[PDB]
Coordinates of C-alpha atoms in Angstrom, one line a residue:
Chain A
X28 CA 3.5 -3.6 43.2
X29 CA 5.0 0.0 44.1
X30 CA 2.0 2.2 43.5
X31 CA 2.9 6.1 42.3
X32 CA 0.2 9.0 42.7
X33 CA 0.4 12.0 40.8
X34 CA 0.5 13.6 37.5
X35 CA 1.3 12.5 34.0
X36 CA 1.6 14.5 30.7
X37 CA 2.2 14.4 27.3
X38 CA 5.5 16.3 26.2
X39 CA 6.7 16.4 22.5
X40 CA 10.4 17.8 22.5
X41 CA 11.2 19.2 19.0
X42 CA 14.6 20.3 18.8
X43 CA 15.6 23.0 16.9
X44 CA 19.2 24.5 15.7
X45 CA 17.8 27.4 15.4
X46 CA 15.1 29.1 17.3
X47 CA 12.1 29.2 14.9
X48 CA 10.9 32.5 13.1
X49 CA 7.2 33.5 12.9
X50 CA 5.8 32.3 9.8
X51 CA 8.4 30.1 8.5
X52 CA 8.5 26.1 7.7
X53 CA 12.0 24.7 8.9
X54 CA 12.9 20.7 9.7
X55 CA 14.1 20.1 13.2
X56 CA 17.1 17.9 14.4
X57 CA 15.2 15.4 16.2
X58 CA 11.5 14.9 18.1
X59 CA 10.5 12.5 20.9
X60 CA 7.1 12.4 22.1
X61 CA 7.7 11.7 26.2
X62 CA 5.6 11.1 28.5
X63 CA 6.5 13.5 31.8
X64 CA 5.1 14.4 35.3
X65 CA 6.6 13.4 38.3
X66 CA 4.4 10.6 39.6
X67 CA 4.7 9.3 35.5
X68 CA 8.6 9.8 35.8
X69 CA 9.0 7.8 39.0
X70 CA 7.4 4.8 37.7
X71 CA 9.3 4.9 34.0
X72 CA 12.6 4.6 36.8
X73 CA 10.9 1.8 38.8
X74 CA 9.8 -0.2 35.9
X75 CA 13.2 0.2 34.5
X76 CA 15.3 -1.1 37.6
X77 CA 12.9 -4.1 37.7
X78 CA 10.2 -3.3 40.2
X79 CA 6.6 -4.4 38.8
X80 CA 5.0 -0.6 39.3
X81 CA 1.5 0.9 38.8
X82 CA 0.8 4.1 38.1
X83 CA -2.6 6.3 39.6
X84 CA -3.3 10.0 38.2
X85 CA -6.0 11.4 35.9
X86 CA -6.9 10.8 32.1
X87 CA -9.7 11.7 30.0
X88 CA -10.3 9.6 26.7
X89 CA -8.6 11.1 23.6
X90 CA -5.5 10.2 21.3
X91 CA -3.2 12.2 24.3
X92 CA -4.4 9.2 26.8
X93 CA -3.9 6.3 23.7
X94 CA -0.3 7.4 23.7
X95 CA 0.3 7.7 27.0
X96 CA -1.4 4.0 27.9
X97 CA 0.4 2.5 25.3
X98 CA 3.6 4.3 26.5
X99 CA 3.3 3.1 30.0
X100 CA 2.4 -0.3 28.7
X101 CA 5.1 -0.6 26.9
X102 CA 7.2 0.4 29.9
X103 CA 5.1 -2.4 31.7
X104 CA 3.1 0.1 34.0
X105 CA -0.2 -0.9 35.5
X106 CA -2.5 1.6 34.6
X107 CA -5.9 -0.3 35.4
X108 CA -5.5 1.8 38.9
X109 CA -5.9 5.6 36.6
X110 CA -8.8 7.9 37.0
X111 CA -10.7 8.0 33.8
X112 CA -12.9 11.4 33.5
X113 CA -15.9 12.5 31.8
X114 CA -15.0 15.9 31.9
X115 CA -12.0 17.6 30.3
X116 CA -8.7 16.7 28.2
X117 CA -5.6 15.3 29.1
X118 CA -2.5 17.9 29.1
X119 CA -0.4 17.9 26.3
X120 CA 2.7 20.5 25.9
X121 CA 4.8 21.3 23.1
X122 CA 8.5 22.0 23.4
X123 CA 11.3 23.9 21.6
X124 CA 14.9 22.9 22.6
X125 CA 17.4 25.5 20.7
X126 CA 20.6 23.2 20.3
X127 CA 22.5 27.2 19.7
X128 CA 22.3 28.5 23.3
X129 CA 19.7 25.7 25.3
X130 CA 16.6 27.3 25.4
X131 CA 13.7 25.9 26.7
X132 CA 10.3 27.2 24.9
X133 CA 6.9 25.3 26.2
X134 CA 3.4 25.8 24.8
X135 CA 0.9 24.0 27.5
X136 CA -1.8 22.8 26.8
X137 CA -3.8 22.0 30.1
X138 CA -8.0 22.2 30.6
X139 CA -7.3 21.7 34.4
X140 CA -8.5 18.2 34.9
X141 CA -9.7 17.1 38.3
X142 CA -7.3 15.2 40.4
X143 CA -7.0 12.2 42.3
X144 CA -9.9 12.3 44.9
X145 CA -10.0 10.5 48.1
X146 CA -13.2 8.6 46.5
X147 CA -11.4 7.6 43.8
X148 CA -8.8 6.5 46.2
X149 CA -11.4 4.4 47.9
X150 CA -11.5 1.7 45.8
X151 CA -7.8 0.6 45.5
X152 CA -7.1 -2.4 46.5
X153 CA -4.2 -1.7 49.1
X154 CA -3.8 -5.5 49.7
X155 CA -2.1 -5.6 46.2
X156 CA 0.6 -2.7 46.8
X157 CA 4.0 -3.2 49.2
X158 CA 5.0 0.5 48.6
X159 CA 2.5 3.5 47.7
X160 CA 3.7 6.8 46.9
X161 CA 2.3 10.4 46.5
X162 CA 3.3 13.2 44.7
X163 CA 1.9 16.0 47.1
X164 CA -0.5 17.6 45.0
X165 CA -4.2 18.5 46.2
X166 CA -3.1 17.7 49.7
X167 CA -6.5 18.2 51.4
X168 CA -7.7 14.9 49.6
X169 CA -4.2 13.3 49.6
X170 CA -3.9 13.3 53.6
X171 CA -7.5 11.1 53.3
X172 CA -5.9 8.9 51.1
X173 CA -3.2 8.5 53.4
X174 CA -5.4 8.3 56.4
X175 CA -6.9 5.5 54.5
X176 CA -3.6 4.0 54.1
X177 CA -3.1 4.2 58.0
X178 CA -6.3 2.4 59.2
X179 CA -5.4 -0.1 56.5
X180 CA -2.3 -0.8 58.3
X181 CA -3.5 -0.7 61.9
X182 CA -5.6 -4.2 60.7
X183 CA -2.3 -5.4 59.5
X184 CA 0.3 -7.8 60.7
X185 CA 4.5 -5.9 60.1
X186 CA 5.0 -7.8 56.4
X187 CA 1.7 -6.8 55.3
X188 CA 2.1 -2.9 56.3
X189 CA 2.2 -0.4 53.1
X190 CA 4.8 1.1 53.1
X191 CA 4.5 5.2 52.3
X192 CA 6.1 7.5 50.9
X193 CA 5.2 11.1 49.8
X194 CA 6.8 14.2 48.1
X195 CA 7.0 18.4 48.6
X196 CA 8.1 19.4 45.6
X197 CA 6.5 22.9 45.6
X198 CA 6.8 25.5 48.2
X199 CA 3.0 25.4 48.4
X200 CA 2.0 26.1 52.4
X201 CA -1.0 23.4 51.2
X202 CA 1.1 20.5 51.0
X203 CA 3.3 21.3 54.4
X204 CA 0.3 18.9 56.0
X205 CA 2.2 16.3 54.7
X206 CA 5.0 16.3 56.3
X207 CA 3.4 14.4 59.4
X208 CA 2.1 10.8 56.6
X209 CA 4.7 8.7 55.1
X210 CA 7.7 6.9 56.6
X211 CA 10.0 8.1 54.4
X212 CA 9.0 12.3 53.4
X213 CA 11.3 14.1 50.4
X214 CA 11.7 17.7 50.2
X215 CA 12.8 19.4 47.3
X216 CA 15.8 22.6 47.4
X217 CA 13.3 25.1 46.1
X218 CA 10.6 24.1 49.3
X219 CA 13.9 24.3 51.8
X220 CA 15.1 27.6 50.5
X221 CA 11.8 28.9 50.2
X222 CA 11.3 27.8 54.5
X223 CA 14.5 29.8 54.8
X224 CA 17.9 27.3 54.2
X225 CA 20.8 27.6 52.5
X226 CA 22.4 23.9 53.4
X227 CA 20.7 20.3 53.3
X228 CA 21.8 19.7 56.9
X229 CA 19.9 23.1 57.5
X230 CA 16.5 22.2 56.0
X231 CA 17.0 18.5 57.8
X232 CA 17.5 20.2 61.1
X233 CA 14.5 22.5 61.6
X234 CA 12.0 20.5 59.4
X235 CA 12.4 16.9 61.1
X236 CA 10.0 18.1 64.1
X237 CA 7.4 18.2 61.2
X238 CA 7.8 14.6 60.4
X239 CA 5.6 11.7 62.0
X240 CA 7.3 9.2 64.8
X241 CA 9.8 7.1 63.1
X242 CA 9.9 8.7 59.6
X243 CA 12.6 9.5 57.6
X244 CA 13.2 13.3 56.1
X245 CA 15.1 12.8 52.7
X246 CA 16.5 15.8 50.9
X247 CA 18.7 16.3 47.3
X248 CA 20.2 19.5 47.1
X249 CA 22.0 20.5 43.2
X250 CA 25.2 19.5 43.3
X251 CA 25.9 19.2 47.0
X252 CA 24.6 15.7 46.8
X253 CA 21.5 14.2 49.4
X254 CA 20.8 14.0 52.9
X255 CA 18.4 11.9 55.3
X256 CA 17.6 12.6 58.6
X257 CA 15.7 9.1 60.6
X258 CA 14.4 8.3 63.9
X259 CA 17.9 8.1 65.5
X260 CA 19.1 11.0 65.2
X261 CA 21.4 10.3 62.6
X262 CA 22.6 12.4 60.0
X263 CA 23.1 10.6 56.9
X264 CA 24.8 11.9 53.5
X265 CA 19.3 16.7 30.1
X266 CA 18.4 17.3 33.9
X267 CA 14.2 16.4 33.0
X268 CA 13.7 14.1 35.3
X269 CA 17.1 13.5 37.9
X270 CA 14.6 14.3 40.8
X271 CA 12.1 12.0 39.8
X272 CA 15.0 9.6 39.2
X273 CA 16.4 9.9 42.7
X274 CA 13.0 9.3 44.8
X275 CA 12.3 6.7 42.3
X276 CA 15.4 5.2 42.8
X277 CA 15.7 6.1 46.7
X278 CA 12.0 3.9 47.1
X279 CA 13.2 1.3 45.1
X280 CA 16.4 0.6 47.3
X281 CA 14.3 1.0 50.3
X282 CA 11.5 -1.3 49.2
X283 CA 14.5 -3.9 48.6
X284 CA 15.2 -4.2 52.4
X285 CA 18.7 -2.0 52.0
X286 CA 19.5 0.9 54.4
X287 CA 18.8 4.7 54.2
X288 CA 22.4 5.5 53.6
X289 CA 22.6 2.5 50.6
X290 CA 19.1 4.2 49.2
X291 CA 21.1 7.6 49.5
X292 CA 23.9 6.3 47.9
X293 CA 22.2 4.5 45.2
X294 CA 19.6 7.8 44.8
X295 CA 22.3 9.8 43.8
X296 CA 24.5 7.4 41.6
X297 CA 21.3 6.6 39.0
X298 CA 19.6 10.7 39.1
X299 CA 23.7 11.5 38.6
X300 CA 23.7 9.2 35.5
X301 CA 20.4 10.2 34.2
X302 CA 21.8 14.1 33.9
X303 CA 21.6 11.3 29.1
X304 CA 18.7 11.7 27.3
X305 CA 15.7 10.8 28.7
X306 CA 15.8 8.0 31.1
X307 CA 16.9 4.7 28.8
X308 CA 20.4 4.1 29.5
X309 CA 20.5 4.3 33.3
Chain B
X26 CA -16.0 1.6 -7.1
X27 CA -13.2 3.8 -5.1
X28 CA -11.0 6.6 -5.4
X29 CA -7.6 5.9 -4.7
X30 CA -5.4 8.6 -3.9
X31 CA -1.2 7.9 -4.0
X32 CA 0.9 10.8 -1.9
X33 CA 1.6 11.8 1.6
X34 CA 0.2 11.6 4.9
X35 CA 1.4 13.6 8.2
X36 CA 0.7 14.2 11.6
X37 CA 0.3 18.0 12.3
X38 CA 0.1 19.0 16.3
X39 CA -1.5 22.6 15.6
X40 CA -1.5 25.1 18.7
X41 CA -3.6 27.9 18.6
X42 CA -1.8 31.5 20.6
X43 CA -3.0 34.3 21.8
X44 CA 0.8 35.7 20.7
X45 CA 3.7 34.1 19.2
X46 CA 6.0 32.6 21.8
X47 CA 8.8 34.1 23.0
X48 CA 12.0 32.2 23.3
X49 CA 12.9 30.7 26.6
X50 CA 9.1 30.9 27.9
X51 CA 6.6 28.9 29.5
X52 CA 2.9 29.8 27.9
X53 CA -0.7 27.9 27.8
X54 CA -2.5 27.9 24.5
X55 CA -5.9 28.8 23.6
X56 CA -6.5 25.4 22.4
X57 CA -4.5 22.2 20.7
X58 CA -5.8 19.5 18.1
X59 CA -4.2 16.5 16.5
X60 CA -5.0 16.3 12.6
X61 CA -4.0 13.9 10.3
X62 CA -2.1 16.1 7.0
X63 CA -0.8 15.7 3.6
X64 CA -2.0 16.5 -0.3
X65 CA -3.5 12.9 -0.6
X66 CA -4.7 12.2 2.7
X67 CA -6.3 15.4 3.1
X68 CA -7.9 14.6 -0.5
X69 CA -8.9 11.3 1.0
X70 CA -11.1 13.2 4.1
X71 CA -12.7 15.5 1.5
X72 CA -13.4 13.0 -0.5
X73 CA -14.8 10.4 2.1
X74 CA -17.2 13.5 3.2
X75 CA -18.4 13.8 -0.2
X76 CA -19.7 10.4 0.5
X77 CA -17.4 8.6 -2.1
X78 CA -15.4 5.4 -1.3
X79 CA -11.6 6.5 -1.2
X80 CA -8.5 4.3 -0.3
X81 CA -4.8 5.8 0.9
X82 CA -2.0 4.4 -0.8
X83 CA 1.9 6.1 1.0
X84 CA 4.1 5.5 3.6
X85 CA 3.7 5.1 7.1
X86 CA 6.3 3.6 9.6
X87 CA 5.3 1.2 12.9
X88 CA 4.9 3.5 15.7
X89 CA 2.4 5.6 17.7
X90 CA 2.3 8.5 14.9
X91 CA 1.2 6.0 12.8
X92 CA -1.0 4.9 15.2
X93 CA -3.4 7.4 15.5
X94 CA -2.8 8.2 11.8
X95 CA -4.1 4.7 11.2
X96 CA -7.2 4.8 13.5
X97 CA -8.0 8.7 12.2
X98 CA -8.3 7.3 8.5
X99 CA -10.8 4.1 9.5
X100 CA -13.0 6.5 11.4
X101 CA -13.2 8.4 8.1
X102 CA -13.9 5.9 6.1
X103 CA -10.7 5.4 4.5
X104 CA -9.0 2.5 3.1
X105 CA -5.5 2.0 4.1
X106 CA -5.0 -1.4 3.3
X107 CA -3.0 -0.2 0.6
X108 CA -0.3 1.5 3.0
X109 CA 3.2 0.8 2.1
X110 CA 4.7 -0.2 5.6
X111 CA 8.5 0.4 6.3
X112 CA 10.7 -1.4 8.5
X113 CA 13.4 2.1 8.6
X114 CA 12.2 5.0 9.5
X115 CA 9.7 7.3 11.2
X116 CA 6.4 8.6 10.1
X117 CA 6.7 12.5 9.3
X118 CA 4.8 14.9 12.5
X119 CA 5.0 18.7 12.5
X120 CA 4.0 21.0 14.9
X121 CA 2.4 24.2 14.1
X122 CA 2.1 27.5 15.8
X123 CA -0.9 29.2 14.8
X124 CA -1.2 33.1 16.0
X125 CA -4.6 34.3 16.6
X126 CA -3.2 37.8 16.8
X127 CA -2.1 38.0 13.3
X128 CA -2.7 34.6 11.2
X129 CA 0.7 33.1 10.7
X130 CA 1.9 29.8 10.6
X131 CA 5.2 28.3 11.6
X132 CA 5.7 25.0 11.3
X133 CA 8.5 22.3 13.6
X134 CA 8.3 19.5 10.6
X135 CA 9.9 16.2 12.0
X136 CA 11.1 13.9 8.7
X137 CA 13.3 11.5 8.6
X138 CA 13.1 11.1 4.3
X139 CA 10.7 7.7 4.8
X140 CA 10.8 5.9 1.5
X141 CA 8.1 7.1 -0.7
X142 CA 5.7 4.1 -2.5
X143 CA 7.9 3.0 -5.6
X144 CA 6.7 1.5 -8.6
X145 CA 6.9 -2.4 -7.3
X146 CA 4.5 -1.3 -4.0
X147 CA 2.2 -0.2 -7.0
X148 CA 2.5 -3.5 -9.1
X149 CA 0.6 -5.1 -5.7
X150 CA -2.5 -2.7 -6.7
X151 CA -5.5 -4.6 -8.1
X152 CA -6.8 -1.8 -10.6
X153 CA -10.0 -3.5 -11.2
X154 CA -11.3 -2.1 -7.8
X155 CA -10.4 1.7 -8.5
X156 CA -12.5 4.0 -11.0
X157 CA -10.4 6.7 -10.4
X158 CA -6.5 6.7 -9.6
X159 CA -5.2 10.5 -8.6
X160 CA -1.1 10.6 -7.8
X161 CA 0.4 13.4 -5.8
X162 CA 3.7 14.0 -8.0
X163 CA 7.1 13.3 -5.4
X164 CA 9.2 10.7 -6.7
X165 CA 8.3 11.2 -10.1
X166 CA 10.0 8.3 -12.0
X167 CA 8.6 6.0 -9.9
X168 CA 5.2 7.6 -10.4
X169 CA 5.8 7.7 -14.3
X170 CA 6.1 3.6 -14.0
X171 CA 3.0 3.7 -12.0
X172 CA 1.0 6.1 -14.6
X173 CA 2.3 3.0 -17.6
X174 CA 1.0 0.7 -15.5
X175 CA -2.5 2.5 -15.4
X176 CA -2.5 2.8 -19.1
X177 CA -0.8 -0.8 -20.2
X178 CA -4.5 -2.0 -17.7
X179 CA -6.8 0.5 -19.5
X180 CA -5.2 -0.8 -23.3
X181 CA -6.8 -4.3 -22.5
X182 CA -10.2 -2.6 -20.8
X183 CA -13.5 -1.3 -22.5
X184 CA -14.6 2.4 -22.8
X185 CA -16.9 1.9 -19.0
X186 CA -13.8 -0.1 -17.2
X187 CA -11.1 2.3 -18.1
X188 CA -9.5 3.9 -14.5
X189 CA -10.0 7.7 -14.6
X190 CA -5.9 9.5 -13.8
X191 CA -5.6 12.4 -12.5
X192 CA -2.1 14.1 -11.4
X193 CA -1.0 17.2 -9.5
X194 CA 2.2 19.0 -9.9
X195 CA 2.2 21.3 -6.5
X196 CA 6.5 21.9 -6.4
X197 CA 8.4 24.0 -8.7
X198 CA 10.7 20.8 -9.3
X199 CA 12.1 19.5 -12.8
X200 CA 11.7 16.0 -12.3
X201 CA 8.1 16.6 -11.8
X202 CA 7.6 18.1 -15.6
X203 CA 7.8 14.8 -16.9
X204 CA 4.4 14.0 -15.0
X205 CA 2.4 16.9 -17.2
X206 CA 1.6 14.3 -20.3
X207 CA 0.0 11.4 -17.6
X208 CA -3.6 11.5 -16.7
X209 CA -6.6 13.0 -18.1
X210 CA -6.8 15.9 -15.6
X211 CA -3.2 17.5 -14.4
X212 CA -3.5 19.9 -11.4
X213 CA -0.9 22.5 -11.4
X214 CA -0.5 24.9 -8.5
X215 CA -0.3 28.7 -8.4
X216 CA 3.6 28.1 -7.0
X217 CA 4.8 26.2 -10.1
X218 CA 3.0 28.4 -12.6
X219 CA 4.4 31.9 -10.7
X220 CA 7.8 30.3 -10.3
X221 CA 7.7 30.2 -14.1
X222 CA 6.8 33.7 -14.7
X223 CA 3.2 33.4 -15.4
X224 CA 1.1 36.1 -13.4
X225 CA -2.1 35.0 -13.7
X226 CA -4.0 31.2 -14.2
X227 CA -5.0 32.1 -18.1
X228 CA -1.5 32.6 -18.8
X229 CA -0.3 29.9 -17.2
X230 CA -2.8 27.5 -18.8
X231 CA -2.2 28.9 -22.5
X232 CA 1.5 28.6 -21.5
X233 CA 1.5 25.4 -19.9
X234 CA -1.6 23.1 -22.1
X235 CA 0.7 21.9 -24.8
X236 CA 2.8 19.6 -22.3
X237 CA -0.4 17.3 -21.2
X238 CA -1.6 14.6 -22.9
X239 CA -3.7 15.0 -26.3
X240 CA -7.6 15.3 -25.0
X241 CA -6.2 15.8 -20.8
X242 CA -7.9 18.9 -19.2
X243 CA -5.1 21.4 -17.0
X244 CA -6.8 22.7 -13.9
X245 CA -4.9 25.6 -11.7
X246 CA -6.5 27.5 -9.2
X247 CA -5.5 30.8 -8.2
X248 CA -6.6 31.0 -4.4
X249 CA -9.0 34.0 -4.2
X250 CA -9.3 34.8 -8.1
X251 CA -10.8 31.6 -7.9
X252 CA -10.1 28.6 -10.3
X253 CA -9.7 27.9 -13.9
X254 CA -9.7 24.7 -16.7
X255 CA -8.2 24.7 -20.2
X256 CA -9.7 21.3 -22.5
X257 CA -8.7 20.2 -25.5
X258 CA -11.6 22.2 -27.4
X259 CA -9.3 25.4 -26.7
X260 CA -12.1 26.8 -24.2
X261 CA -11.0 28.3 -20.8
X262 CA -12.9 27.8 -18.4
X263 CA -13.3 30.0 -14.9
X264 CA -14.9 30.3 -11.4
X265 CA -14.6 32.9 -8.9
X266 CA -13.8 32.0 -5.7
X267 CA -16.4 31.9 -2.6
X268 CA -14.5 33.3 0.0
X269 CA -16.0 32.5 3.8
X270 CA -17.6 35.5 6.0
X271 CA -14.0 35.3 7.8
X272 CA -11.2 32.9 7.1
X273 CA -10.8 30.9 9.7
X274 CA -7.9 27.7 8.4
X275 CA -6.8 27.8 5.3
X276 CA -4.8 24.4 5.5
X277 CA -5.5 22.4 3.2
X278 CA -8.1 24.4 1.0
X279 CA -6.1 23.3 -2.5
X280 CA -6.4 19.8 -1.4
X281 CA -9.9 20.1 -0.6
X282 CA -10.7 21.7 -4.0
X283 CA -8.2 18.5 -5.4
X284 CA -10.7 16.5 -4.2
X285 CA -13.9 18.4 -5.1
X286 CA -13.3 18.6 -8.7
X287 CA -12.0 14.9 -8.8
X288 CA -15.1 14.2 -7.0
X289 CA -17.5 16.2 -9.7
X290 CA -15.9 14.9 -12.5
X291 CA -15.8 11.2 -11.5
X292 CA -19.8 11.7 -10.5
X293 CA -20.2 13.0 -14.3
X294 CA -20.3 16.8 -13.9
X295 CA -19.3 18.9 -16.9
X296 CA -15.5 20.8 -15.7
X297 CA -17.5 23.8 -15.0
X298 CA -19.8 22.5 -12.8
X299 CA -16.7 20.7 -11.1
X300 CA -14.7 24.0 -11.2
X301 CA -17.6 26.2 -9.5
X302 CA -18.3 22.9 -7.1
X303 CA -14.3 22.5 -6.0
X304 CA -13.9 26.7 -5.4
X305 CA -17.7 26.0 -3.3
X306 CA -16.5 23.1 -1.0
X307 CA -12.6 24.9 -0.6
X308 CA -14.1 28.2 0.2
X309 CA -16.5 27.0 3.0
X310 CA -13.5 24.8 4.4
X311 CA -12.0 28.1 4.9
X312 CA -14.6 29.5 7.3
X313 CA -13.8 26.2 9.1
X314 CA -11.6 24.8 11.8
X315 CA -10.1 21.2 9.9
X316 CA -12.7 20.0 7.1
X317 CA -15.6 18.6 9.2
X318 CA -18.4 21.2 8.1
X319 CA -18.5 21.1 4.4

């Protein structure tokens, strides 16, 4: 199994052909009740291209949590691996899409529930995962986990090794501690232009130092495609989702036994289809 | 026996703001909660908190809506096994905005038209287990062949085994006149009688008595002038309402005083004990977040 840490919520997309006005009762064009969050989205992509996936983030009890389970389920996502808590609800957010111009309206509903611990993390069995991946987070208790992972591997003969993989999404200085875990790291645009870039090649260039010895720096820019940036010193070259969709993918190829530059290749032709509805159809 | 109660059910997503969201934004709510919606589902709740045995009888389609529809109803008590299932379709959910602010309420409803429950779903009902049928008036010539039904049973049972009808005409629609002259209790709503002119629930019931059946009661209420009854002894009959300290939700307050009076009357209250009891309960589940508290 590819294991995927992180978040998961409940989004119900109404959309609308019109935006609506306060106190009125109109019928929308369509609704889909998705299940979103990165970590979530990665394995819907996984479980989709065939890989046997589980999925590890925080629920609390409640009809939000019944759909989700069931959702992932159906998808065919382990979810015996989630963090069930005492305290709080799961998030749930409702959206307006205006078909007229493309506006995005989002009520959220989120009681902050507690993340992923590294107690919590504890007592996985990492003897039944060939590829774990974490969606950089509360990266304090995430580089424990991955610590964990590391001493794991040190017992280990090379086909028994976990491979890891993690993910900088947000330009939180927090999560820059993980840049030095994972074999393969992926930074997002927004975290590269916020470290001052304007290029892909940039960001690779300056940010590779950060990396541990013999990881690879992956990063999709918008429309400029994706680069990666290994050991050798190689350089190598509805939207709700398409970054999910290329790590997702990008770990899949890799887990395969294909090359960075097949991966990069791949990453970008399946997050380039998925920009469809939803992510059936890819 | 049971109450069975024919109609529509719903999933309503209600989010409570601060303010009313502003296109394009990005906004947490004060809170969220998933309840189940619908004349004769919400009748069902009230009626199951009454303590009485009730049983749903509409559409639903496979799916998770359903789902937690489904598992909402058995932790209330309610019998669903006589759910009309469809294979095409989707089961109705709406979410509502609910501003704190100022009181409104807009509403995203998601339908998809499921087929309602015809005439033939109703031929599968065994009426021996029912004292008391009550139809939500939709697809009234259906419903019509369902009301014969009830009365072609009750022409070969005695005076003690004879189902109790009740019906309720909510929507200023013409197809739904025809359902006036079927059951022995005919709700009509404040809508229908001020669509027709009528300004007050007196007029409407001097106006509207002669289409119900010879011996049937008409029941309107008149949200906070309260509620009234007109019988066949020509005697109109009134309660005030009981409004809460602060209103609080008002969905599904005419359901809940559906229910209330169908609930009195079918114990063997008098109709002005089961007026003065259904304005009681409806008022209270005013000062009330859903209907849990009455």
């Amino acid at each position: 199994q590819i294991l995927c840490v992180g978040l998961v919520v409940l989004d119900i997309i109404n959309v609308v052909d019109k935006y609506p006005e306060e106190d009125t009762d109109r019928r929308c064009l369509s609704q889909r009740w998705q299940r979103g969050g990165n970590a979530s989205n990665s394995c819907t992509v996984l479980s989709l291209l065939g890989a046997r996936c589980a999925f590890m983030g925080s629920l609390a009890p409640g009809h939000v949590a019944d759909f989700l389970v069931a959702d992932f389920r159906q998808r065919g996502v382990d979810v015996s691996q989630v963090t069930w808590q005492s305290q709080g609800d799961t998030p749930c957010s409702c959206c307006i899409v205006n078909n007229s111009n493309g506006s995005r309206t989002i009520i959220l509903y989120d009681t902050n529930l507690p993340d992923v611990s590294a107690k919590d993390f504890e007592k996985v069995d990492l003897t039944r995962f060939k590829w774990i991946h974490i969606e950089g987070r509360n990266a304090s208790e995430q580089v424990k986990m991955l610590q964990r992972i590391e001493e794991h591997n040190a017992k280990q003969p090379l086909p028994q090794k976990v491979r890891v993989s993690v993910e900088i999404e947000k330009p939180r200085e927090e999560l820059f501690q993980l840049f030095s875990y994972g074999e393969v790291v992926f930074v997002s645009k927004d975290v590269a232009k916020h470290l001052g870039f304007q290029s892909a090649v940039e960001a690779l260039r300056g940010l590779y130092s950060r990396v541990k010895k013999g990881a690879t720096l992956v990063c999709a820019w918008a429309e400029e495609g994706a680069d990666a940036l290994g050991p050798d010193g190689q350089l190598l070259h509805d939207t709700l989702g398409a970054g999910d969709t290329f790590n997702a993918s990008v770990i899949f190829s890799l887990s395969k036994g294909n090359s960075m530059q097949e991966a990069l290749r791949f990453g970008c032709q399946v997050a380039g289809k998925k920009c469809l509805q939803g992510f059936d159809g890819i």
